[PDB]
Write a protein that holds these residues in place. Structure first.
Motif, PDB file in Angstrom:
ATOM      1  N   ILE A   1      23.703 101.558  -4.436  1.00 48.41           N
ATOM      2  CA  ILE A   1      23.308 100.192  -4.103  1.00 48.41           C
ATOM      3  C   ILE A   1      23.624  99.253  -5.254  1.00 48.41           C
ATOM      4  O   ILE A   1      24.309  98.251  -5.067  1.00 48.41           O
TER       5      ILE A   1
ATOM      6  N   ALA B   1       9.668 113.667  -2.829  1.00 50.06           N
ATOM      7  CA  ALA B   1      11.048 113.685  -2.339  1.00 50.06           C
ATOM      8  C   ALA B   1      11.584 112.287  -1.988  1.00 50.06           C
ATOM      9  O   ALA B   1      12.772 112.024  -2.167  1.00 50.06           O
TER      10      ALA B   1
ATOM     11  N   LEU C   1      17.062 103.055   3.221  1.00 48.31           N
ATOM     12  CA  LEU C   1      17.924 102.328   2.294  1.00 48.31           C
ATOM     13  C   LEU C   1      19.351 102.072   2.791  1.00 48.31           C
ATOM     14  O   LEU C   1      20.059 101.239   2.217  1.00 48.31           O
TER      15      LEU C   1
ATOM     16  N   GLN D   1      15.131 110.924  -3.618  1.00 47.17           N
ATOM     17  CA  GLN D   1      16.213 110.397  -2.815  1.00 47.17           C
ATOM     18  C   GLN D   1      16.363 108.888  -3.048  1.00 47.17           C
ATOM     19  O   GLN D   1      17.473 108.393  -3.210  1.00 47.17           O
TER      20      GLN D   1
ATOM     21  N   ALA E   1      14.281 108.451   3.849  1.00 45.58           N
ATOM     22  CA  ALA E   1      14.656 107.670   2.676  1.00 45.58           C
ATOM     23  C   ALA E   1      16.099 107.168   2.776  1.00 45.58           C
ATOM     24  O   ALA E   1      16.393 106.022   2.442  1.00 45.58           O
ATOM     25  N   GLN E   2      17.002 108.026   3.250  1.00 40.38           N
ATOM     26  CA  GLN E   2      18.390 107.646   3.441  1.00 40.38           C
ATOM     27  C   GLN E   2      18.491 106.517   4.470  1.00 40.38           C
ATOM     28  O   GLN E   2      19.010 105.448   4.177  1.00 40.38           O
TER      29      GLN E   2
ATOM     30  N   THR F   1      13.477 113.121   3.216  1.00 35.79           N
ATOM     31  CA  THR F   1      14.819 112.917   2.660  1.00 35.79           C
ATOM     32  C   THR F   1      15.673 112.067   3.581  1.00 35.79           C
ATOM     33  O   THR F   1      16.229 111.040   3.189  1.00 35.79           O
TER      34      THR F   1
ATOM     35  N   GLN G   1      20.547  97.942   3.156  1.00 33.13           N
ATOM     36  CA  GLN G   1      20.925  97.148   1.986  1.00 33.13           C
ATOM     37  C   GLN G   1      22.287  97.529   1.411  1.00 33.13           C
ATOM     38  O   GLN G   1      22.999  96.652   0.925  1.00 33.13           O
ATOM     39  N   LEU G   2      22.689  98.798   1.520  1.00 31.12           N
ATOM     40  CA  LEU G   2      23.994  99.240   1.032  1.00 31.12           C
ATOM     41  C   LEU G   2      25.101  98.497   1.773  1.00 31.12           C
ATOM     42  O   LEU G   2      26.011  97.936   1.168  1.00 31.12           O
TER      43      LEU G   2
END
Lengths: 51, 53
Positions: free
Chosen positions: A51, A39, B25, A43, B21-22, B18, B28-29
């Protein structure tokens, strides 16, 4: 010995039910284990898109 | 009894992984979005510089 072999059969029929159910349960565990591991990539790859 | 617990654990782990992971990251966004605004002005100096030349 006649009673022995009959006793061994009933022990085997008991064994049979157990190992059969272990397998059924392990399939379920194994299935959701893979999803839990992967998972982060499902994701992660999806987020690299923005990005 | 073990199976009954194992499946909920895996099910909850999908969501936890999940959401992790969000969050992981998410930094960097914004760094990209912020740089997007910055670069516009970094090269805007070139326009003003050339105009005086």
């Amino acid at each position: 010995l006649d009673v022995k072999f009959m006793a061994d059969t009933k022990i085997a029929d008991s064994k049979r039910a157990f190992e059969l159910q272990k397998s059924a349960f392990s399939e379920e565990v194994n299935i959701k284990t893979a999803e839990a591991q992967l998972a982060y990539e499902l994701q992660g790859a999806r987020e690299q898109q923005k990005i | 009894a073990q199976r009954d617990y194992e499946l909920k654990k895996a099910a909850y782990d999908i969501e936890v992984n999940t959401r992790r992971a969000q969050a992981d990251l998410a930094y960097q966004l914004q760094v990209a979005k912020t740089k997007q605004q910055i670069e516009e002005q970094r090269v805007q100096v070139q326009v003003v510089e050339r105009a005086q030349q």
